[PDB]
Design a protein around this ligand. Structure first.
Ligand SMILES: Nc1nc2c(ncn2[C@@H]2O[C@H](COP(=O)(O)OP(=O)(O)OP(=O)(O)O)[C@@H](O)[C@H]2O)c(=O)[nH]1
Ligand SMILES: Nc1ncnc2c1ncn2[C@@H]1O[C@H](COP(=O)(O)OP(=O)(O)CP(=O)(O)O)[C@@H](O)[C@H]1O
Ligand SMILES: Nc1nc2c(ncn2[C@@H]2O[C@H](COP(=O)(O)OP(=O)(O)O)[C@@H](O)[C@H]2O)c(=O)[nH]1
Ligand SMILES: [Ca+2]
Ligand SMILES: [Ca+2]
Ligand SMILES: [Ca+2]
Ligand SMILES: [Cl-]
Ligand SMILES: [Mg+2]
Ligand SMILES: [Mg+2]
Ligand SMILES: [Mg+2]
Ligand SMILES: [Mg+2]
Lengths: 54, 428, 438, 351
């Protein structure tokens, strides 16, 4: 069971103990997604106001 | 999401709305002149939700008062809290509406609604962030029913991205002014299904029975009915009026309560039940509150919850009490009655606690269920409708104001569709 | 020295950042006005606490923090509370109306109007950095802001700062304190859109913190304040190696290298011992062996799962207090004999260890007692996938009926994104099962 | 009123446990996929332990131990006995067994198998083996075994056939013993005092191996290929009073000294080995489980463990009692209501 890569300093110490070895989208694709959703919103709102106009 | 605009329309609308403002002003420490005289500052932390701030640090209800005749609004003006209302927010005609949806919606109401919308816009423009609107009215007369649904259509036109919330008293023969009430209700329900986000179904039948059977009042007045309604309204709005985690604005409440757009008709309940005089002195224990609030006889919409299933539930406990105890009790009611809560909406009962109790009680619980049992209410209305409509009885009162039988047929159809949509989920 | 920017998003994110920054100042001896009498390099420097604090000419130490919420009340309590002076106004961003527990409302509708303001206030902090490592993002799965806006933010951080690492502290939804029925929807949605943008995520299940509070703090019904001081203790364990001299997890790349060999399985389990009530009259202090042993009790984990029925890919032990390597090795040696710890066949069976000699700091008048030694273990076990199973199940139950979906579609989302996200989660669950079951 | 759910309907045991649970009037069954249950009587494969223990206000309990399949699959059991120091390759009550994969796939100890079989080739010892994984075969030369293994698809074990079994007279026939073990939520190991001898009805014939009715004692097999099924004992099933009386009258022992001491030792060693991997002592849900341990008695009255079954069925007459026993000590011990049929296996020797 071997202790390795041991480092020490005034404030601590750190080491490794081994027990056994091994056996994106772009800026405007995004403003695209956001504006597609905004236009879906405005279409639904317009169908609402056309129904209310009737 | 702060300010709510309150509209009350018609005789019933305005009587219950007046009682509502009396009750909640007392809870928020506001006197009939709008002067604040309170102890806790939990009272003022969210008082701008329902009140504008005036020049002598006075508080004015964000309240518009609408009628097609002046009788009831005159009596509110001279009522105990009458002088607290902005006098320009009283908007009324002279005609009356004659218990006639068509006069409310198409003829008499068309004349007045533009001035109502002027006052509504004047109130909306002052709001730093408007949440939406709450309307109180009945669905069985004419002004509240017909003109209130008119107003809701106009408001949705001018503010399509705000929440529309109503307290709607349903009519019952047990408490009944005129025989055309089912007609007026069916027409109105057709509007409510399409134009509001959350509707509290306050059934005058259930209010009668609670006054009669459990409260032991022999001959209940509209005063005794409105007492129940004022307390229920207080309770269903406490989460909006006080600092809070849960269902704290109209939209978050809607998201929590309305899984399907049309199924937004809520069954409210109150515990303990109080008769306005008896003043009863017993300590209510949390298990008692929880068992009562869930019991049919404490519910304002005359339906049997065991004939349906809860899609969502919002519970609100008021008073100093153990939140460990209420958490335990809420889980015990759901865990021992799990059959009656749809299994395909997990954790659909959400629960809130607020420190300040209502006047007269150390502890109180308000219930808001979106049960599919509510179909029973609508089914009852539709039977009373068909019994008349199949002989087209009393229709002249409506056709004389320009209406066609086909509008009645559509409204009937849409309500029967609403009830089928409720039963789709009761077997799932 | 290389600077880290913390971004706190939503109610949960802002309230947890509050707790952590309180803690950090206590630990580094920074006071509420922001003065640090122990810092003698006045006006700047490249000590390792500068990783989290910048310095001004007047001696003020300022968190490299941005708080963003779509509604004003919570960040207003930051602006007005005990650390009002710590933060510059431009670091606190509020909207006027929130996201109503709606992922789509926070991501699409309201996110779009504030994303640019937020990226500029972030760029302002990055411009004060000589070498920026990347970001620590605090948020909840369940809230509309914390779920939807966070994912928008993460997409745009990957484009604007593409070479930088990004870490999440994510709050996973629990019914005992949750505020909304659609919290499983929000969780799946934001996990799916943030998965490729985040290099290491520390989940915290509010159910586990809640029961730790009940069971070991003698708290009858925990509040967010109880929850958050415990969570900040764990966060400070996890970040102490960026804020202090050492040789283990000295930068953000090291967290990925040490805890994440496969990029999608980037959800390390955190276990933390001891949690001891400050109102305990007599408490026998616990040994290295006892607390390291506690690291392998499910009752001490930030997510309740069973690591015995999974495999490990990595395990770090972060000790704070009086600990020396020989006691740690003694403890590990006997623990392996008495416990079911099995790593994947393609990974060493070992433990990277970090010790800081300063015992855990605890907030005066908190619930937590002071102790002589405490440990946070970070272990990438496949058993954490239990938490996804749970969530996915709930999701399926509602989406089979399309319950509440209309609230999302009405904000401009498309029904189909629900199932693209759910299928991504299915991929995730099966990645875990491949790696850890036979 | 406690609440429970049922996700294995093909379960003979827990069907009767459901019935007895309901007929208390303190338990109510819910529908299969309702979360708010106290007790899950779960499916066999892919039981969702990950979803148990997360409903506040509900102590939850389940009739299976996560990870106990290690003891109840044949290959898993061979691996568990060999690798674990508490049992070891030196183990005296397990037959010499080896895990073999078909070469259709490609771990595997075939090379290790033939070395032992070759020194038994060479040492004039009996050298018949059984190959197992309905799909079994017994033979004296290895080639037969290995190529049978590979014209099937899946993983097998090859185990020393017990060439000298104890044989009941009249009949000169074979038998195996099945014991019903129940491990509760606290890891008490309860042995059910009634076991059963699943017998053969055809005389045991050491020469012609391929006739499997005298060699394999499955209740399935002798109700299908056996001439005398039902001659000596009803259902080819002798119970413990008759077996004890036979041991007394014919061999001068008793069943507890000659056989049961070893069976209790094997049961407790097996379960106390896996205890740290499957215990639910400090977990957020809790497990119990009914196991069926299967033993073979050789002619010198030495017991050998054959296999462990994770979802066992009971012999008919015993259902009533054992099922009541599952309710009293596994279920009602967690969920109280308003002479005992188990031996609690416990032994703390000092050294
Ligand atoms: N641990 C912890 N959880 C919190 C805290 N605040 C909220 N939550 C949890 O977060 C979820 C709700 O998300 P929030 O962050 O409050 O919502 P939000 O991001 O502000 O989004 P919106 O309010 O919809 O604009 C629920 O699961 C709550 O239990 C907190 O301070 N600590
Ligand atoms: N090593 C061995 N030596 C001699 N006989 C053996 C043996 N292994 C198995 N047998 C015989 O085969 C039968 C056991 O078959 P097996 O162990 O595969 O059970 P099984 O999985 O087929 C059904 P069950 O679960 O009901 O016991 C025993 O009755 C025994 O007579
Ligand atoms: N609960 C309650 N119901 C009322 C009250 N006044 C009238 N109603 C009911 O409302 C219906 C009549 O509507 P109403 O408001 O009087 O007519 P409107 O002014 O034209 O809208 C009938 O069903 C009455 O039972 C009241 O004060 N309380
Ligand atoms: Ca006129
Ligand atoms: Ca400095
Ligand atoms: Ca990246
Ligand atoms: Cl970069
Ligand atoms: Mg005009
Ligand atoms: Mg009237
Ligand atoms: Mg918020
Ligand atoms: Mg078997």
């Amino acid at each position: 069971m071997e202790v390795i890569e041991l480092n020490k300093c005034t404030s601590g110490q750190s080491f490794e103990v081994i027990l056994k070895p091994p056996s994106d989208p772009s800026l405007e694709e995004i403003q695209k997604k956001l504006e597609a959703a905004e236009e879906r919103r405005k279409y639904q709102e317009a169908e609402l106001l056309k129904h209310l106009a009737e | 999401m702060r300010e709510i605009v309150h509209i009350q329309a018609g005789q019933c609308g305005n009587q219950i709305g007046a009682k509502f403002w009396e009750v909640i002003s007392d809870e928020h420490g506001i006197d009939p002149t709008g002067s604040y005289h309170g102890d806790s500052d939990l009272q003022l932390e969210r008082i701008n939700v329902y009140y504008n701030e005036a020049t002598g640090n006075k508080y004015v209800p964000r309240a518009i008062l609408v009628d097609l005749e002046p009788g009831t609004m005159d009596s509110v003006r001279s009522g105990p809290f009458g002088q607290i209302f902005r006098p320009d927010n009283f908007v009324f005609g002279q005609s009356g509406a004659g218990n006639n949806w068509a006069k409310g919606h198409y003829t008499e109401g068309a004349e007045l609604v533009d001035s109502v919308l002027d006052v509504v816009r004047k109130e909306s423009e002052s709001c730093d962030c408007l949440q939406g609107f709450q309307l109180t009215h009945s669905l069985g007369g004419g002004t509240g029913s017909g003109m209130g649904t008119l107003l809701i259509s106009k408001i949705r036109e001018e503010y399509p991205d705000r929440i529309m919330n109503t307290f709607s008293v349903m009519p019952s023969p047990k408490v009944s002014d005129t025989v055309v009430e089912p007609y007026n209700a069916t027409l109105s329900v057709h509007q409510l299904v399409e134009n509001t986000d959350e509707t509290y179904c306050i059934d005058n039948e259930a209010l009668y029975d609670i006054c009669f059977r459990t409260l032991k009042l022999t001959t209940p007045t509209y005063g005794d009915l409105n007492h129940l309604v004022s307390a229920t309204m207080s309770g269903v709005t406490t989460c909006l009026r006080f600092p809070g985690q849960l269902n704290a604005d109209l939209r978050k409440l809607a998201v929590n309560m309305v899984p399907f757009p049309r199924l937004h008709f809520f069954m409210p309940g109150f515990a303990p039940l109080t008769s306005r005089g008896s003043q009863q002195y017993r300590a209510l224990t949390v298990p008692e509150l929880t068992q009562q609030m869930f019991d049919s006889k404490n519910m304002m919409a005359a339906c049997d919850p065991r004939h349906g299933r809860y899609l969502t539930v919002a519970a609100i406990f008021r008073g100093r009490m153990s939140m460990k105890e209420v958490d335990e009790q809420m889980l015990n009611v759901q865990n021992k009655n799990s059959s009656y809560f749809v299994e395909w909406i997990p954790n659909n009962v959400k629960t809130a606690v607020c420190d300040i109790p209502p006047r007269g009680l150390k502890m109180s619980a308000t219930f808001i269920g979106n049960s599919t049992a509510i179909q029973e209410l609508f089914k009852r209305i539709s039977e009373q409708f068909t019994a008349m409509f199949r002989r087209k009885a009393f229709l002249h009162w409506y056709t004389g104001e320009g209406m066609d039988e086909m509008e009645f047929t559509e409204a009937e159809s849409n309500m029967n569709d609403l009830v089928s949509e409720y039963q789709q989920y009761q077997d799932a | 020295m290389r600077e880290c920017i913390s971004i706190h998003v939503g109610q949960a994110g802002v309230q947890i950042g509050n707790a952590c920054w309180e803690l950090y100042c206590l630990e580094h001896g920074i006071q509420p006005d922001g003065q640090m009498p122990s810092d003698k390099t006045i006006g700047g420097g490249d000590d390792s606490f500068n990783t989290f604090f910048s310095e001004t000419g007047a001696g003020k130490h300022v968190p490299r923090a941005v708080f963003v919420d779509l509604e004003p009340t919570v960040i207003d309590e930051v602006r007005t509370g005990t650390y009002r002076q710590l933060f510059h106004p431009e670091q606190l961003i509020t909207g006027k109306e929130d996201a109503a527990n709606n992922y789509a409302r926070g991501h699409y509708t309201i996110g779009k109007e504030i994303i640019d303001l937020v990226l500029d206030r972030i760029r302002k902090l990055a411009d004060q950095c000589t070498g920026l490592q990347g970001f620590l993002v605090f948020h909840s799965f369940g809230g509309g802001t914390g779920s939807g806006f966070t994912s928008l933010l993460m997409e745009r951080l990957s484009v604007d700062y593409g070479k930088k690492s990004k870490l999440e502290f994510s709050i996973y939804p629990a019914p005992q304190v949750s505020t909304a029925v659609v919290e499983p929807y929000n969780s799946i949605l934001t996990t799916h859109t943030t998965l490729e943008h985040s290099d290491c995520a520390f989940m915290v299940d509010n159910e586990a913190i809640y029961d730790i509070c009940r069971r070991n703090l003698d708290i009858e019904r925990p509040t967010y304040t109880n929850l958050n001081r415990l969570i900040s203790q764990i966060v400070s364990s996890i970040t102490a190696s960026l804020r202090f001299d050492g040789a283990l997890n000295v930068d953000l790349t090291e967290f990925q290298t040490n805890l994440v060999p496969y990029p999608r399985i980037h959800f390390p389990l955190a276990t933390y011992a001891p949690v001891i009530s400050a109102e305990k009259a007599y408490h026998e202090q616990l040994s290295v062996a006892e607390i390291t042993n506690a690291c392998f009790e499910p009752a001490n984990q930030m997510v309740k799962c069973d690591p015995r029925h999974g495999k490990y890919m990595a395990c770090c032990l972060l000790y704070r207090g009086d600990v020396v390597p020989k006691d740690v090795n003694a403890a590990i040696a006997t623990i392996k004999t008495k416990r079911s710890i099995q790593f994947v066949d393609w990974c060493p069976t070992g433990f990277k260890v970090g010790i800081n000699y300063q015992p855990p700091t605890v907030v005066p008048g908190g619930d937590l007692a002071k102790v002589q030694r405490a440990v946070c273990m970070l272990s990438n076990t496949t058993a954490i996938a239990e938490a996804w199973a749970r969530l996915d199940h709930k999701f399926d139950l509602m989406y089979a009926k399309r319950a509440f979906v209309h609230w999302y579609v009405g904000e401009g989302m498309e029904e189909g994104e629900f199932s693209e996200a759910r299928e991504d989660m299915a991929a995730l669950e099966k990645d875990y099962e491949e790696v850890g079951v036979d | 009123m406690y609440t429970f759910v049922v996700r294995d309907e093909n379960s003979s045991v827990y069907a009767e446990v459901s019935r007895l649970l309901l007929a208390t009037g303190q338990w109510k069954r819910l529908r299969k996929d309702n979360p708010r249950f106290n007790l899950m009587l779960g499916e066999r494969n892919r039981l969702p332990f990950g979803r148990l223990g997360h409903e506040p206000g509900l102590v939850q309990l389940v009739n299976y131990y996560r990870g106990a399949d290690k003891l109840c699959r044949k290959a898993s059991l061979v691996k568990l006995i060999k690798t674990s120091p508490e049992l070891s390759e030196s183990c005296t009550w397990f037959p010499e067994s080896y895990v073999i994969y078909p070469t259709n796939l490609k771990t595997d100890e075939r090379e290790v198998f033939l070395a032992a079989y070759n020194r038994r080739r060479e040492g004039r010892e009996g050298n018949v083996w059984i190959a197992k994984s309905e799909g079994i075969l017994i033979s004296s030369e290895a080639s037969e075994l290995l190529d049978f293994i590979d014209e099937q698809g899946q993983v097998h074990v090859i185990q020393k056939y017990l060439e000298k079994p104890l044989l009941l007279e009249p009949g000169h026939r074979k038998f195996d013993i099945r014991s019903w073990v129940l491990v509760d939520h606290l890891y008490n190991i309860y042995l059910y005092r009634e076991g059963v001898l699943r017998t053969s009805s055809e005389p045991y014939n050491s020469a012609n191996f391929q006739d499997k009715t005298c060699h394999l004692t499955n209740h399935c097999i002798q109700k299908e290929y056996s001439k005398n099924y039902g001659r000596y004992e009803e259902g080819n099933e002798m119970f413990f009073e008759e077996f004890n009386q036979y041991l007394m009258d014919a061999l001068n022992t008793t069943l507890e000294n000659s056989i049961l001491l070893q069976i209790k030792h094997i049961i407790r060693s097996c379960l106390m080995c896996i205890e740290p991997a499957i215990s639910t002592k400090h977990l957020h849900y809790q497990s119990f489980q009914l196991f069926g341990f299967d033993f073979m008695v050789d002619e010198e009255l030495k017991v050998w463990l054959i296999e462990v079954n994770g979802a066992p069925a009971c012999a008919q007459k015993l259902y009533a009692e054992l099922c009541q026993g599952i309710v009293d000590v596994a279920i009602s011990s967690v969920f109280p209501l308003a002479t005992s049929i188990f031996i609690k296996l416990h032994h703390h020797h000092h050294h």
